[PDB]
Write a protein of this length. Structure first.
Length: 115
């Protein structure tokens, strides 16, 4: 069993909830969701998902909050990707940049490249 990939999903919005429920149902993954909003987290707790309060303005805090995870999935706005990726790297976890809104993030990605 305890060979599960241990994932931290940063962001408790819609996509955070979806990827959490997916991971929760899998036999090869463990999931924790980290967010600043305690009501948002309550939702995840009402799904049986482990949660952790974080604050992306406190970078050392965030790094420490991401310790012990195999990977960190952003379910957060694209604009926090630099912060979450840095904390993930500092924590020794692989970083997967899904974001809270894939269409918007993809459009930002296209701008960056239409350059």
């Amino acid at each position: 069993n305890a060979m599960r990939w241990n994932i931290c999903v940063v962001g408790a919005g819609k996509i955070g909830q979806m990827i959490a429920a997916l991971l929760k149902t899998s036999s090869n993954y463990s999931v924790t969701v980290a967010d600043h909003d305690l009501a948002a987290l309550a939702v995840l707790n009402r799904m049986g998902v482990a949660t952790k309060q974080v604050d992306a303005k406190d970078e050392a805090g965030l790094a420490k909050a991401l310790g012990g995870f195999d990977a960190v999935i952003s379910a957060a706005p694209f604009f926090l990707t630099p912060i979450i990726a840095k904390a993930a790297k500092a924590a020794g976890a692989h970083y997967f940049d899904l974001t809270e809104d894939v269409a918007a993030t993809n459009a930002v990605r296209a701008l960056v490249e239409d350059s």
